[PDB]
Amino acid sequence: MIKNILGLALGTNSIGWALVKQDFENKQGEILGMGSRIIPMSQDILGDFGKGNSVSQTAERTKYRSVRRLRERFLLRRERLHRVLYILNFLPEHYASQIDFEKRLGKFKVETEPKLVWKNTDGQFSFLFQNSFNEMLEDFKAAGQELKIPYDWTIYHLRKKAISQKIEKEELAWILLNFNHKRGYYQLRGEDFEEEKDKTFVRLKVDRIVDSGENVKGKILYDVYFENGWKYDKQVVKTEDWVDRTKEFIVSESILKNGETKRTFKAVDSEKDWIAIKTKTEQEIEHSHKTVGTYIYETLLQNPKQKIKGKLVRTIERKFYKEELRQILEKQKEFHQELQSDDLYNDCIRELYRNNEVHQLTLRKKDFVHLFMEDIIFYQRPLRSQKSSVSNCTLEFRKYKGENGAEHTQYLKAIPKSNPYYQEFRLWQWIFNLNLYTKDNDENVTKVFLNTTQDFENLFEFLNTRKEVDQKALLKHFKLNEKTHRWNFVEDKKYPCNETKTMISSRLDKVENISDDFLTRDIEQKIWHIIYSVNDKVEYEKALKSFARKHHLDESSFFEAFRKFPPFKSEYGSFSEKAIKKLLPLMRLGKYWNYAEIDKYSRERIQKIITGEYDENIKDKVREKSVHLTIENDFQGLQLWLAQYIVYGRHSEASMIGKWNSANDLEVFLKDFKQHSLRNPIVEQVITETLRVVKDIWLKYGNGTKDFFNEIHIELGDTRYISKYISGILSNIVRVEDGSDEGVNSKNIVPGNGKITTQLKQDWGLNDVWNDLILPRFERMNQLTNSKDFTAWNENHQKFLPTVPIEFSKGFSKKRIDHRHHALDALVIACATTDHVNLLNNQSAKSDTKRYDLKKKLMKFPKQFLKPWEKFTVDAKHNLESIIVSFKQNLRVINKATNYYEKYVEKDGTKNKERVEQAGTNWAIRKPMHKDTVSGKVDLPWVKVPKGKILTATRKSLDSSFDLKSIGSITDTGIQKILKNYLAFKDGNPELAFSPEGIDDLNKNIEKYNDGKPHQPINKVRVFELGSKFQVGQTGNKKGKYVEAAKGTNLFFAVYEDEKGKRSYETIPLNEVIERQKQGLTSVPLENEKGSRLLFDLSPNDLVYVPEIDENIDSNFVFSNLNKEKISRIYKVEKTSGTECYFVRQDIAYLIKQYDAKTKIGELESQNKLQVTMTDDRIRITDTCVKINCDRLGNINF
RNA sequence: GAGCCGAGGUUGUGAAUUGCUUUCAGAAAAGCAAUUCACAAUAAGGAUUAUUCCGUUGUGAAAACAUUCAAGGCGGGGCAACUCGCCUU
DNA sequence: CGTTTTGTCTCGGCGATAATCATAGT
DNA sequence: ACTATGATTATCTAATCTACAAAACG
Known part of the structure; x- marks a missing residue:
C-alpha cells in the first residue's frame, strides 16, 4: 500500500541515485529525491579500461615505489662498500674525509658532492690517477688515434689492466664502485636450460626460391634457401621482400631422439628488438675471447667517438660482469696483502653484521672475494614470500584468546592442490x-x-x-x-x-x-x-x-x-x-x-x-x-x-542471515571494508562511495530506521561482474526474515535490462524531457556557428529536435553530454516494478487471455503504458531541472606516514630482531609534486627577461619539426647559425633537411654549414623557454632543477581584497600549501605582501553561484528557494593558472563539439571551458561569485 | 594485486675537444652550447645501521589509521640466520 | 587583458596460444 | 602402415588519448 523503492545507476565513475514511494493500487506515487555523485576521472581511464593498459593509480604508485626501492638498494650497496673500503683503508683521504663514519655510516656529509678521482684543492680540481691516464695515453698513441682524451676513460684501462697486473687500491675501490653501478641482466631462478641453447644471431643471404607445389588461398606457397645450406622452416609467399635480402635470424637448435638438429628460424632485426641486441652484443664479446671491460676498451680504442653507455653495451648477462670482477679480485688478492688479512676480514664482518652472529660464523669461512662479489655487490634478494596471502580454509577454524581479553579465530591456510x-x-x-x-x-x-x-x-x-x-x-x-x-x-x-x-x-x-x-x-x-x-x-x-x-x-x-x-x-x-x-x-x-x-x-x-x-x-x-x-x-x-x-555438521555452505536494522550497521561495515577485495580498484572505489551515498539517503529520508528500503533496484546500462556482488551486499538491508525470502540475494533486489528502460522512456516521454532539456545548448551552438544545422524540425511534435551534422557525428550521443543522465537512468530503473519487468521480459504469452489482465492494468487501450501517476512526466522533468550535481573533492595534500622497519632491539640482556615504528613526525605528500621533465636555469643576454620570470632550457632531439621558429628557440647561436645554413641549403624544407638521412648528411659535412669551421656532431639541442619554473628542493644540486607544476596540482585560487572594493587574483602553488599545512596553518595565506585581506579561495570541483547582474548578494543567505533559474547559474571550477579561473556549468559533462584548431569552433571556445557565463550577459564569474556547499546528496549546506 | 631485477633519458659537478656572442686584450675570462667519460640527484624530505625502510593507494577530524601482527610444542631445509608446514588455545 | 596554441619521461624480463615434428599403439 | 597423441618454438599479447598548465600570440 506504501512501498519505498531506491534505484542506483552505477557507472564507471558516476553514481546516479533515486528514491520513489508509490501506491500502485491507487495509481499514486512520488519521487523523494534524485541526484548524481561524480568521482573525478579523466577520459583516458574511461577509454583504456575497456582494453586494459595499466588502468590503476595504485599501479603507477607501485611503479614509482619500485623504481625508488631499486634506488635505495643501490645506495645501500654503495654505503656498505664505503664502510668496507674505509676499514680496508682503500678510499682516498679527500673522499674519505667527506664521508660520515660515525653517525650516518657511509653517507656523504651534508652540502658535499665529493668525487673519488677529482681532488678539490684550493678551488682547482685535479685528477687523482695521473700515471694510469698516462699509460692509457701511450696505449692510444700506439693505436695511433689521438692524444687528447677525457681523464675519466681510465676506468676501462684499469678494468683491462686489473686482469693480470697490480693496480692501486684507490683504483680498485673505483673499479668496485663502478661495478656496483652496472650489474647486468640476471634471472633469479637460474635453472640452466637445454645444454645446446643455440639461439645464435646470424646474417644470411637468400639464394633461391624453388616452388614446392603447395597451393593455399589461391596461391602456391614457396620456401626459402640460404647460402650455408639452411632452409627457412615456414613458407614464403611475397617474393619481393625475400629475394637476396640479408635478413638476420635467431636460429635455435636441439638434438632430438633421432639424433639431428631441429633448426628453427626467427626473422629479427637489430637495434629495435631487445633479444637481438643482447644476443649480438654477447656474441661479439664471446668471439673476442675477452671480458666485457676489455672488449669495451678495445672498441673505444678503435673508434674513439663510439658511444659506450646505451649504444655499445646495453644489456648483457650478469655472468660477464661476475666473471670480470672475479678475475680482477682473484688477481688483486695476490698483490694486496690487506685482502689476505684475517684480522681485517674479521673487522669488516663485525662492522657489517655486528648483531648477526650466525651470518658472521657463515662468512668466517669465506674470503674477501666472496664478500665483495657474492655478499655485497651482486647480492640479489629472493622473491618476497606470499604465503600470508594464501586463501584460508572455510571449515576448520582455530580459536584463541589474545592479550586484550578477547577471543578471535585464527584461519587455516588452504591445502595446496598438489599435496x-x-x-x-x-x-x-x-x-x-x-x-x-x-x-x-x-x-x-x-x-x-x-x-x-x-x-x-x-x-x-x-x-x-x-x-x-x-x-x-x-x-x-x-x-x-x-x-x-x-x-x-x-x-x-x-x-x-x-x-x-x-x-x-x-x-x-x-x-x-x-x-x-x-x-x-x-x-x-x-x-x-x-x-x-x-x-x-x-x-x-x-x-x-x-x-x-x-x-x-x-x-x-x-x-x-x-x-x-x-x-x-x-x-x-x-x-x-x-x-x-x-x-x-x-x-x-x-x-x-x-x-x-x-x-x-x-x-x-x-x-x-x-x-x-x-x-x-x-x-x-x-x-x-x-x-x-x-x-x-x-x-x-x-x-x-x-x-x-x-x-563438521553443516549441509554445505548454508550462508548467514545478514540483516541490518540501522544505519550504524552500514557505517561499521564501511569502517571494516577492506581494500583490493574486488577485480580492480575502480569498482571497489565506486561501491564504497555507492554505499556511502546509500547511508546518506537512509539518514536523510528515513533516519536510519529499520526496513526503510523495501526494495533496491540496481542496474547499470566487463561491467557485468558488478551487477551481483552489490546486490548481495545490499541484501543486508532488503531482506525479509519471515522465511519466504531466502537466498544469497533477496528477491527485493530486481536488476533489469535495457529494453524495459528504453520502452518506458519512450512511452512515458523521458526521451522528450531529455531532448527539450538539452535543446538550449544546441540552440546556443546554432547561434555561435550562425547556421541552422544543429536543430531539425518535425511537424508531428511541432517543435525543434536536437541533432548534429554528419561531419560532427563521430561519437556524439544525446545521452552522454549531461551528468543528469545518471539520475535519469536511476529513476527509470527505480520505477520499474515487478509487474512491468515481468510483462516486458515474458511478453510471449501463448494465449491472449492470460496476459490481458496486465494489459488492462498497465497499458492504456500495445500502444502506451499508463503513467505511474497523473503528473509523472511533469514532476520528473522538474526534478531533473532542480538537480545540483555533487562532485567529490580530493584535497588530500599531506598525510601522516607510518614506517615500520626491522631492527635489533635489546631485550632481557639479548638482541633479537623485530619490527620498530619510526619515531618523530613524517609527512607523506599525496600529490605529484611536479612534472618529470627537468629544466635548467640559464640567462641569455640577447633575450629580454621581464621581471618575475626566468629562462629554462632542456635538451631536445633534432627532428623534422625544426623550422625557423623552432630554430630561433635554441639557446646556443652557433647551432642556430649552422641549422639555418643547412635549412637554406635544402630549399627551406625541414622534412628533407632534418630527416635521419638528412641529419647524417649534415653531420658528415658540417664544415660547409659553419663557414668552414669545425663543429661537433649535432643530435640533440637545448631549447629555452621564458616562464615561471620553481626549484625542486634546497639541498645539493636540487636547487638547480627547475620543473613545472604537475597536472591537476593547482588546487587553490585565492582572491584578495583591499578596503576600497578592488579584487586581486592569485593561484597558490602546491609547495606553499605543503608548508602551510605541515605548519598547521590554513591552506591559503590570508594575507598578501600589499596587505589586502583574503576574500576566499576556489578549488577544482567546487560549485559557485553567479547572481544576476541586477541582484546584489552580500548577506542574502536563504538557500532554500533554489528554483530552476537559480541552479541554471551554478558553475563549477575546472582549472586555474595565474590570474585565470576557468568554469564549466555544473550540469555539463561532455561538450557537443570539442574545439579543433582546424574549424576553430567549439561549445566553450578553445579551452572547452569559459572564464565567463555561457549566457548572453557574459560576465566574469570571479567578480561576483559566491560559494555554495554541497553534501553527497547535492543539498546546499548553508 | 604484488614482488625480484635490468637499460636509457633529464638536471648538476668535474674533465677532454670544438663552436657562437660579449668583455678584456691573436692571448685570457664570462654567458650559451655540441660529441664522449666518471660521478651526484632523480618526486621536497624523515628514520635507521637491518645486508630494514617510509614518501603520487584509500578512509576521515582523531593529523587517527587499513594496506604488517599471538602464545607455545611436533617437524623439513640448508654454513644457518631464516623460511616452509603440523598440533591446541 | 583576452585568447589560442603547445607540451607532457621511455624502453626490457618473470607470459598466452598455434602450428609442425616426432612418436608409439594399433 | 595408419592414427592419434606429447612436445618445442613462432606468433602474438593494442593500440591508446586526455586535458591541465602555461607560454605565445593578438
Whole structure:
C-alpha cells in the first residue's frame, strides 16, 4: 500500500541515485529525491579500461615505489662498500674525509658532492690517477688515434689492466664502485636450460626460391634457401621482400631422439628488438675471447667517438660482469696483502653484521672475494614470500584468546592442490563420480563392473600408478573398448590421476640399485616437502644431498634425477590439510578403510546417527539421507557432502542471515571494508562511495530506521561482474526474515535490462524531457556557428529536435553530454516494478487471455503504458531541472606516514630482531609534486627577461619539426647559425633537411654549414623557454632543477581584497600549501605582501553561484528557494593558472563539439571551458561569485 | 594485486675537444652550447645501521589509521640466520 | 587583458596460444 | 602402415588519448 523503492545507476565513475514511494493500487506515487555523485576521472581511464593498459593509480604508485626501492638498494650497496673500503683503508683521504663514519655510516656529509678521482684543492680540481691516464695515453698513441682524451676513460684501462697486473687500491675501490653501478641482466631462478641453447644471431643471404607445389588461398606457397645450406622452416609467399635480402635470424637448435638438429628460424632485426641486441652484443664479446671491460676498451680504442653507455653495451648477462670482477679480485688478492688479512676480514664482518652472529660464523669461512662479489655487490634478494596471502580454509577454524581479553579465530591456510593428500581425495572423488555408459543404447552399464568394494579398490590401485587417465586406458583396465562404451564425460578429455606419485616413483626407479619398497606414504610426503618448501637452487641441492645421506640411498643418480625437477604450479584447494585428513577415512573404502582412523567427533556422530537418538547437531534431513547407513560398515565410499556433514555438521555452505536494522550497521561495515577485495580498484572505489551515498539517503529520508528500503533496484546500462556482488551486499538491508525470502540475494533486489528502460522512456516521454532539456545548448551552438544545422524540425511534435551534422557525428550521443543522465537512468530503473519487468521480459504469452489482465492494468487501450501517476512526466522533468550535481573533492595534500622497519632491539640482556615504528613526525605528500621533465636555469643576454620570470632550457632531439621558429628557440647561436645554413641549403624544407638521412648528411659535412669551421656532431639541442619554473628542493644540486607544476596540482585560487572594493587574483602553488599545512596553518595565506585581506579561495570541483547582474548578494543567505533559474547559474571550477579561473556549468559533462584548431569552433571556445557565463550577459564569474556547499546528496549546506 | 631485477633519458659537478656572442686584450675570462667519460640527484624530505625502510593507494577530524601482527610444542631445509608446514588455545 | 596554441619521461624480463615434428599403439 | 597423441618454438599479447598548465600570440 506504501512501498519505498531506491534505484542506483552505477557507472564507471558516476553514481546516479533515486528514491520513489508509490501506491500502485491507487495509481499514486512520488519521487523523494534524485541526484548524481561524480568521482573525478579523466577520459583516458574511461577509454583504456575497456582494453586494459595499466588502468590503476595504485599501479603507477607501485611503479614509482619500485623504481625508488631499486634506488635505495643501490645506495645501500654503495654505503656498505664505503664502510668496507674505509676499514680496508682503500678510499682516498679527500673522499674519505667527506664521508660520515660515525653517525650516518657511509653517507656523504651534508652540502658535499665529493668525487673519488677529482681532488678539490684550493678551488682547482685535479685528477687523482695521473700515471694510469698516462699509460692509457701511450696505449692510444700506439693505436695511433689521438692524444687528447677525457681523464675519466681510465676506468676501462684499469678494468683491462686489473686482469693480470697490480693496480692501486684507490683504483680498485673505483673499479668496485663502478661495478656496483652496472650489474647486468640476471634471472633469479637460474635453472640452466637445454645444454645446446643455440639461439645464435646470424646474417644470411637468400639464394633461391624453388616452388614446392603447395597451393593455399589461391596461391602456391614457396620456401626459402640460404647460402650455408639452411632452409627457412615456414613458407614464403611475397617474393619481393625475400629475394637476396640479408635478413638476420635467431636460429635455435636441439638434438632430438633421432639424433639431428631441429633448426628453427626467427626473422629479427637489430637495434629495435631487445633479444637481438643482447644476443649480438654477447656474441661479439664471446668471439673476442675477452671480458666485457676489455672488449669495451678495445672498441673505444678503435673508434674513439663510439658511444659506450646505451649504444655499445646495453644489456648483457650478469655472468660477464661476475666473471670480470672475479678475475680482477682473484688477481688483486695476490698483490694486496690487506685482502689476505684475517684480522681485517674479521673487522669488516663485525662492522657489517655486528648483531648477526650466525651470518658472521657463515662468512668466517669465506674470503674477501666472496664478500665483495657474492655478499655485497651482486647480492640479489629472493622473491618476497606470499604465503600470508594464501586463501584460508572455510571449515576448520582455530580459536584463541589474545592479550586484550578477547577471543578471535585464527584461519587455516588452504591445502595446496598438489599435496598427495589432495591428490588422494580428488582421485577418490573422481572414482566415486565415475560411471560408464554404452554406445549402443546409452544405458547405465555401470553398477555391474563397479559394484563391490573389490572393483573400486582395483580401480583406485590402477589409477594410483598412473599420472593421467583417459578413454582408452580406463577402458582397457576394464577390458572395454571405445567402439562399445563411454565413461559419461568428454571422450577426448583427461583428468588428473595423482601425477605426483607417478613422477616420484619414476625418479625413485631411475636411481635404481634400491629395492622396490622405499616409496611409502611418509617418504613420499617427506620428498614432497623437500621439493616444494625448499624453492632455491643451492638449498634444494643441499637438501636432496642430505636426504640421500640420511636414508640408505646412493647419492649419485638420485640427485641427478631430482636436481632438474620441474617447479610446481601455484594452486590451493578449497579446504586445508586437516580437512582432507579428516575426510579421507570417510572417503576410503575396502582395505584402505578402518574405523580406528576416524576422529572422536565423527565417530560419535556416526554412533548417534546409527543408534537413532536425538541430538541438537543432527538435522532431520541427515536421517532422511543417512537412513541407508544403518550400520557403521556402510560408512564406506560416501560422497563429499555426507563426509563433510559427518566431520563438521553443516549441509554445505548454508550462508548467514545478514540483516541490518540501522544505519550504524552500514557505517561499521564501511569502517571494516577492506581494500583490493574486488577485480580492480575502480569498482571497489565506486561501491564504497555507492554505499556511502546509500547511508546518506537512509539518514536523510528515513533516519536510519529499520526496513526503510523495501526494495533496491540496481542496474547499470566487463561491467557485468558488478551487477551481483552489490546486490548481495545490499541484501543486508532488503531482506525479509519471515522465511519466504531466502537466498544469497533477496528477491527485493530486481536488476533489469535495457529494453524495459528504453520502452518506458519512450512511452512515458523521458526521451522528450531529455531532448527539450538539452535543446538550449544546441540552440546556443546554432547561434555561435550562425547556421541552422544543429536543430531539425518535425511537424508531428511541432517543435525543434536536437541533432548534429554528419561531419560532427563521430561519437556524439544525446545521452552522454549531461551528468543528469545518471539520475535519469536511476529513476527509470527505480520505477520499474515487478509487474512491468515481468510483462516486458515474458511478453510471449501463448494465449491472449492470460496476459490481458496486465494489459488492462498497465497499458492504456500495445500502444502506451499508463503513467505511474497523473503528473509523472511533469514532476520528473522538474526534478531533473532542480538537480545540483555533487562532485567529490580530493584535497588530500599531506598525510601522516607510518614506517615500520626491522631492527635489533635489546631485550632481557639479548638482541633479537623485530619490527620498530619510526619515531618523530613524517609527512607523506599525496600529490605529484611536479612534472618529470627537468629544466635548467640559464640567462641569455640577447633575450629580454621581464621581471618575475626566468629562462629554462632542456635538451631536445633534432627532428623534422625544426623550422625557423623552432630554430630561433635554441639557446646556443652557433647551432642556430649552422641549422639555418643547412635549412637554406635544402630549399627551406625541414622534412628533407632534418630527416635521419638528412641529419647524417649534415653531420658528415658540417664544415660547409659553419663557414668552414669545425663543429661537433649535432643530435640533440637545448631549447629555452621564458616562464615561471620553481626549484625542486634546497639541498645539493636540487636547487638547480627547475620543473613545472604537475597536472591537476593547482588546487587553490585565492582572491584578495583591499578596503576600497578592488579584487586581486592569485593561484597558490602546491609547495606553499605543503608548508602551510605541515605548519598547521590554513591552506591559503590570508594575507598578501600589499596587505589586502583574503576574500576566499576556489578549488577544482567546487560549485559557485553567479547572481544576476541586477541582484546584489552580500548577506542574502536563504538557500532554500533554489528554483530552476537559480541552479541554471551554478558553475563549477575546472582549472586555474595565474590570474585565470576557468568554469564549466555544473550540469555539463561532455561538450557537443570539442574545439579543433582546424574549424576553430567549439561549445566553450578553445579551452572547452569559459572564464565567463555561457549566457548572453557574459560576465566574469570571479567578480561576483559566491560559494555554495554541497553534501553527497547535492543539498546546499548553508 | 604484488614482488625480484635490468637499460636509457633529464638536471648538476668535474674533465677532454670544438663552436657562437660579449668583455678584456691573436692571448685570457664570462654567458650559451655540441660529441664522449666518471660521478651526484632523480618526486621536497624523515628514520635507521637491518645486508630494514617510509614518501603520487584509500578512509576521515582523531593529523587517527587499513594496506604488517599471538602464545607455545611436533617437524623439513640448508654454513644457518631464516623460511616452509603440523598440533591446541 | 583576452585568447589560442603547445607540451607532457621511455624502453626490457618473470607470459598466452598455434602450428609442425616426432612418436608409439594399433 | 595408419592414427592419434606429447612436445618445442613462432606468433602474438593494442593500440591508446586526455586535458591541465602555461607560454605565445593578438
